């Protein structure tokens, strides 16, 4: 049976990822941009109903709602080659395009002042397509509506849909790099909680490693906010493609969130991509071993994930999923698996269900793979503790300093105290804590 | 059913053309709400399906015996819903009394719009004398017109009562005594009737009587 | 022997969709603008007599009446390609410039000034008629012909066919007046009309801009959607069929209680032809899971959360190649889906007939469907038709302008007791969804 996603994008990050991810999706299921499904994929082994809602044109439009307060994304989004590809009616734009300020309590207060808008294309999304698995809120976490209408989201589709999975692209904020919001880091905080609380599974998305990554492993100078877009939708593609194509294992987002997060609360996925490089880094005669992938991925070079090097969080991975776009071949499978495991590519958590799994899967037909073996790396690692402790710090800085309180105090989420900030520290502290005990064994 | 909607207001005039207008109205109503969908279904079950399904048995005759059994399958088609068998004959014996049933409030609101029309015919009958009379100078009310139009305008409110109950039971029995049959039509085993069973619809008291409709 | 409708078009609106209509049937029977039936339609196995009445020059004349008293609808309506198709003793335009003026009251006076006009129109058109099943008055009830000569029409009608069914097809606004006038179009729809069609302008608009595409509708686009759905509910009486060749059996199927009249329609698919459906076949089930979206329901019927909207009966005549067998699957699953909520005054009456669309006129779809359902929602809609009545009456607003006519000349009583008609709709419609309506009038 199809299991549609809500993409449910918030803020300008959140826009562009939602978007990027809905053009991928119709690359790889081979659907125009104008949703008229492309001359190739008529015979395509794509889900197209499992990864996309069917409109009235047939057109494979994913059951994808773009609500920002901002108009600058929507505008964008709408201008985008694929927008008859997904359904108007899930797209609402608040005409009033202030935007959250980068605060993640305004956000909130956005994403609840536009739930009767947001939730009823959630709502609407959900009726259109046939067994709607959940929803996933790609929105940035230093954003206001990417945090704070990120976290609203999270819980209207929590409370809307208890039962169903609440994944978020959260682009976590550069921890390392100086945040032009000062109140950002009370942002990152209250995205960080709004990943904990109302979102079942948070992908941290830190555009200082999006940036890194780029520069160093693509060769991609200063990546900007539409290149961090363009690799979550690569990203998500590949992440799709064995949603498109059927295939053997991990079949639904329920069993890959079964299968990377041994704790429900310790959902916080960081991200990877191997092989690492630019599209123009062609692999000389270079016959990909499952072993060679699994260390590129173990690579931090590969790592899309900005988890601080902290020496104090034992980073270990609590599960490591390999998601494979091409001709892999199972038994080069198993003996990556061994390989890895003898040569330790891979640091798991001490205090976590081993999970190395080696599943063989197909790529989306339409989507033409340039490596015989792409890789997405999903993997719980108490680097990301570090990560996270570098945005309670920073959210502490801010609150404890006032930065840009005023903006945080101006909305109703903070208006007696930065709460909502602070508690938002607190949240991402306590799952800081948790993966760094994941990664050790007292976790349990 | 266009009957118990209009030809209640042919003598609407009288309180006792009331019950029975009303009872035998929610009668018709029920019986031809509920026999709206049975309209489309019994347009599906042997009427759409078995003429392409002929047309089909036909396309494949290439000798005169290949030809033989294209007829003879369109011919069971139709034969399919209609319960023709003696086996089928509790339920064909059913859905017939389902169709006695709508006969029976067929002459019920015949009998209702005949009650509707010529009692209605007494109100009018007698004003020509009078009106003639006043023209011609005559005064005072007859004494054996007054009478008689007393007489029928008793017989008017008090008989109507057996139009009431007549229409009455036909309101309770539109969409409750179809049961007898329903009770077969309950146990439907074919799709297309349990698809019947499904859309049983319409009755004001079979959904809310019949336990099977609701 | 051929079963003819007759049509009584009233105000400029009225007489636009009556022309489209007949346009429409024409296309449909393969009748030329002249009515002449082309020869790819002489040979047609639809009763083009049900449609229109068959002039013997083999023109299909409609037996529709085109009643305007403003010059410029009834000269534009008389200007259209179909002045010969029509015949033009079926046509009556008021030579009282003043019109019927956005009110009820108005409209009324000029209805009965007009009453013997109407009533020798229709006479008339049942004698160009062979088995002519009723009579459809089309008017907009906040218009001043819509609603004042729709009450006059009714009563004329009632009075002189009440044998034959009495179809109206309320218009409803996208006039201070307006109110008033909604309400005495409301009672006069209630008291003189066996069957009323809501075809609101707001929800009408709603689903051509959301599918079609079309911003700022005009009345136009709104009278070609309501031609597409009457054509797909006539499309059984224009081709002799097996079963639902007649509007008796369908307005006794969706308002089994002529009080409870408010019949409400579908069209699916409800898409422009520019509206490509990438090779989706149009299935009775797909057509049935659309119509079961409210979004494709044309008729602004308030969705009261408090108040349970549900479809007391539904028929959905498809129209074009549907299957019966994926007819009947697709009443069953909506039954089972519960994608349409009936009332407990009957069962959850769905019901799916595969009829063929007429082959001269181009149906896009394989498998089309056309709803006609009678819902509770639509006591939503007679409640807020109530409410702007009360709205215009409470305050007399345009009140005054009724009194100049008489249905408001004494006092705007008649806007009142029609706002009360509209408000007793309403709710026995709600007792309609609700399971006494069996023995409310017991």
Redesign the interface.
């Given at each position: 049976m199809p299991r549609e996603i809500i993409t449910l994008q918030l803020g300008q990050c959140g826009n562009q990822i939602g978007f990027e991810f809905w053009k991928q999706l119709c690359a790889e299921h081979g659907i125009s941009p104008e949703?008229?499904?492309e001359e190739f994929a008529?015979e395509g082994t794509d889900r197209k109903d499992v990864f996309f809602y069917?409109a009235?044109?047939?057109?494979y439009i994913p059951r994808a709602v773009l609500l920002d307060l901002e108009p600058r994304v929507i505008h964008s989004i709408l201008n985008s080659p694929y927008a008859k590809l997904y359904n108007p009616?899930n797209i609402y734009l608040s005409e009033h395009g202030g935007g959250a300020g980068n605060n993640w309590a305004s956000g909130f207060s956005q994403g609840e002042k536009i739930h009767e808008d947001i939730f009823d294309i959630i709502d609407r999304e959900a009726?259109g397509s046939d067994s709607l698995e959940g929803f996933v809120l790609c929105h940035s976490i230093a954003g206001g509506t990417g945090s704070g209408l990120g976290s609203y989201l999270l819980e209207r589709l929590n409370d809307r849909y208890p039962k169903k999975l609440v994944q978020t692209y959260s682009v976590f904020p550069n921890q390392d790099e100086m945040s032009d919001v000062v109140v950002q880091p009370y942002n990152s905080l209250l995205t960080l909680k709004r990943l904990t609380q109302n979102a079942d599974c948070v992908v941290v998305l830190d555009n200082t490693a999006l940036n890194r990554i780029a520069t160093d492993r693509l060769h991609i100078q200063n990546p900007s906010f539409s290149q961090i877009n363009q690799l979550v939708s690569t990203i998500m593609s590949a992440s799709t493609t064995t949603l498109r194509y059927p295939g053997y294992m991990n079949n639904d987002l329920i069993g890959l969130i079964a299968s990377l997060i041994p704790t429900p609360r310790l959902h916080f996925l960081m991200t990877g991509y191997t092989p690492l490089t630019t599209d123009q880094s062609v692999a000389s005669v270079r016959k990909t071993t499952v072993l060679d992938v699994m260390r590129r991925l173990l690579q931090p070079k590969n790592v899309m994930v900005s988890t601080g090097r902290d020496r104090q969080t034992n980073h270990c991975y609590i599960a490591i999923l390999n998601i494979i776009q091409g001709e892999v071949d199972p038994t080069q499978v198993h003996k990556s698996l061994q390989r890895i495991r003898e040569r330790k590519l891979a640091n798991f958590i001490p205090w976590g269900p081993a999970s190395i799994q080696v599943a063989l899967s197909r790529k989306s037909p339409y989507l033409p793979s340039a490596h015989r073996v792409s890789g997405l790396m999903m993997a719980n690692h108490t680097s990301i503790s570090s990560l996270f402790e570098s945005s309670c710090q920073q959210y502490d800085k801010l609150r404890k300093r006032e930065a840009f309180l005023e903006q945080f105090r101006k909305e109703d989420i903070f208006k007696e105290n930065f709460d909502e900030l602070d508690r938002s520290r607190e949240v991402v502290q306590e799952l800081i804590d948790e993966y760094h005990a994941a990664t050790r064994p007292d976790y349990i | 059913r266009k009957g118990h909607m209009c030809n209640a207001r042919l003598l609407r005039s009288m309180p006792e053309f009331s019950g029975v207008l009303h009872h035998c109205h929610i009668l018709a109503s029920e019986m031809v709400h509920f026999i709206h969908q049975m309209q489309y279904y019994v347009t599906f079950e042997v009427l759409e399906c078995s003429w392409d399904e002929l047309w089909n048995r036909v396309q494949r005759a290439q000798d005169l015996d290949h030809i033989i059994a294209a007829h003879e399958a369109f011919l069971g088609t139709v034969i399919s819903r209609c319960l023709l068998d003696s086996d089928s004959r509790a339920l064909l014996n059913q859905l017939r009394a389902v169709f006695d049933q709508i006969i029976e409030l067929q002459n019920t609101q015949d009998a209702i719009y005949r009650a509707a029309l010529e009692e209605l015919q007494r109100r009018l009958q007698f004003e020509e004398k009078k009106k003639q009379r006043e023209a011609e100078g005559q005064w005072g009310v007859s004494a054996a017109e007054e009478e008689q139009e007393k007489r029928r305008v008793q017989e008017f409110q008090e008989s109507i009562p057996k139009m009431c109950s007549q229409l009455r039971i036909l309101t309770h029995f539109y969409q409750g005594v179809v049961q007898q049959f329903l009770v077969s039509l309950t146990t439907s085993s074919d799709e297309s009737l349990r698809f019947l069973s499904f859309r049983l619809d319409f009755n004001e008291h079979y959904r809310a009587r019949e336990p099977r409709l609701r």
């Open positions: 949703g008229i499904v008529t069917q009235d044109d047939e057109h009616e009726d | -």
